C-alpha cells in the first residue's frame, strides 16, 4: 500500500514457416497479472485476468484491443529490422521482449519508470532512471538509440510514465485494492526421512500460502543452517496458492535439537516447528 507498480510484459516471437509471429501483452499490478492480449486466438482481444477488471466497460477493452493489434504490427516490423541489424537469416525464430511501466509510492507519486527491451534473451536497450537517456547493450542497439534520441522518444516515455501509467495505476489500485491485499497464511509441518544409515532428513513444508514471498529456515540451537540446508524454489500449487520446503540432514537421534522457522506476511508471528513423531 506503500510502493505499487503497473507493468506490461510484452513478447514477440517469429515463427518462420509456421505462420505469423506470436504476440502477447501481459499487464501486472503489484506483480499480479490483471490483463492479457494473445494474438494466437480467434479474433484476438484484450481480456481481464482478474474479476475486478470486469468493471471497466466495453470502451476500455475495445481501445486496448485496437492498441494491442497496432503494437503487434510494430513488433512485426521490429523483428524484420533486427534481422538486418544483426545480419540474420529470415528462416530462424527470434524473440523480442519488453518490460514497460512504472512504480509509485504510497503518496501516489512516481518512484521509478521502466522501458526495457531484449532480443533473444539479452538486454538490447533500456531507458535510464533519469527518463532522459538510453543505455544500449550492443552496436545494433546504438542504431535504435541514435534514432530514438533524435525523435525524442525519452520525452514521449516520461510523459506516458508521469501521467497515463501513474494515473491508470491509481485507477487499477482502487478497483483491485482489497483483492491485491489478499493473504493466505501457510500451513506448515515437518516430515522425517531415512534411508538405512546413521543420518535422517528433516523436511519442513509450507503449503497453501499467498502471496509467494516466504522464508523457511532451519536452526541448530539458535544458529541458522543456511550452508547445510536444501531448499526448493517456491512453486505454484495450481490452485492459486504456493508451496515450498527446506530440508536438513541431521544425525539419527538428534532430531529434537533442530527447529524450522516459517516467515510469511499472513502470519501473526513466524511459525516455529520441530519433528513430531505421530501419536
Amino acid at each position: 500500500m506503500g510502493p505499487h507498480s503497473l507493468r506490461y510484459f510484452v513478447t514477440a516471437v517469429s515463427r518462420p514457416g509456421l505462420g505469423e509471429p506470436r504476440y502477447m501483452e501481459v499487464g501486472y499490478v503489484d506483480d499480479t497479472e490483471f490483463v492479457r492480449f494473445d494474438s494466437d486466438a480467434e479474433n484476438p482481444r484484450y481480456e481481464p485476468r482478474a474479476r475486478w477488471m470486469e468493471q471497466e466497460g466495453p470502451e476500455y477493452w475495445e481501445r486496448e484491443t485496437q492498441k494491442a493489434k497496432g503494437n503487434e504490427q510494430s513488433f512485426r516490423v521490429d523483428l524484420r529490422t533486427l534481422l538486418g541489424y544483426y545480419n540474420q537469416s529470415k528462416g530462424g525464430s527470434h524473440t523480442i521482449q519488453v518490460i514497460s511501466g512504472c512504480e509509485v509510492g504510497s503518496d501516489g507519486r512516481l518512484l521509478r519508470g521502466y522501458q526495457q527491451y531484449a532480443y533473444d534473451g539479452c538486454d538490447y536497450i533500456a531507458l535510464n532512471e533519469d527518463l532522459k537517456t538510453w543505455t544500449a547493450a550492443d552496436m545494433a542497439a546504438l542504431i535504435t538509440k541514435h534514432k530514438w534520441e533524435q525523435a525524442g522518444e525519452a520525452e514521449r516515455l516520461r510523459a506516458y510514465l508521469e501521467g497515463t501509467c501513474v494515473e491508470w495505476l491509481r485507477r487499477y489500485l482502487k478497483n483491485g485494492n482489497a483483492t491485491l491485499l489478499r493473504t493466505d497464511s501457510p500451513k506448515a509441518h515437518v516430515t522425517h526421512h531415512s534411508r538405512p544409515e546413521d543420518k535422517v532428513t528433516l523436511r519442513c513444508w509450507a503449503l497453501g500460502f499467498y502471496p509467494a514471498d516466504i522464508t523457511l529456515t532451519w536452526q541448530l540451537n539458535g544458529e541458522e543452517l543456511i550452508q547445510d540446508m536444501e531448499l526448493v524454489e517456491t512453486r505454484p500449487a495450481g490452485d492459486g496458492t504456493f508451496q515450498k520446503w527446506a530440508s536438513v540432514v541431521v544425525p539419527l537421534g538428534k532430531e529434537q535439537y533442530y527447529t524450522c522457522h516459517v516467515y510469511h506476511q499472513g502470519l501473526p508471528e513466524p511459525l516455529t516447528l520441530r519433528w513430531e513423531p505421530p501419536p
Partner: peptide, 8 residues
C-alpha cells in the same frame, strides 16, 4: 494502460 510502441 499499455504504451504504444514505436520502431527499433
Amino acid at each position: 494502460k499499455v504504451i504504444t510502441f514505436i520502431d527499433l
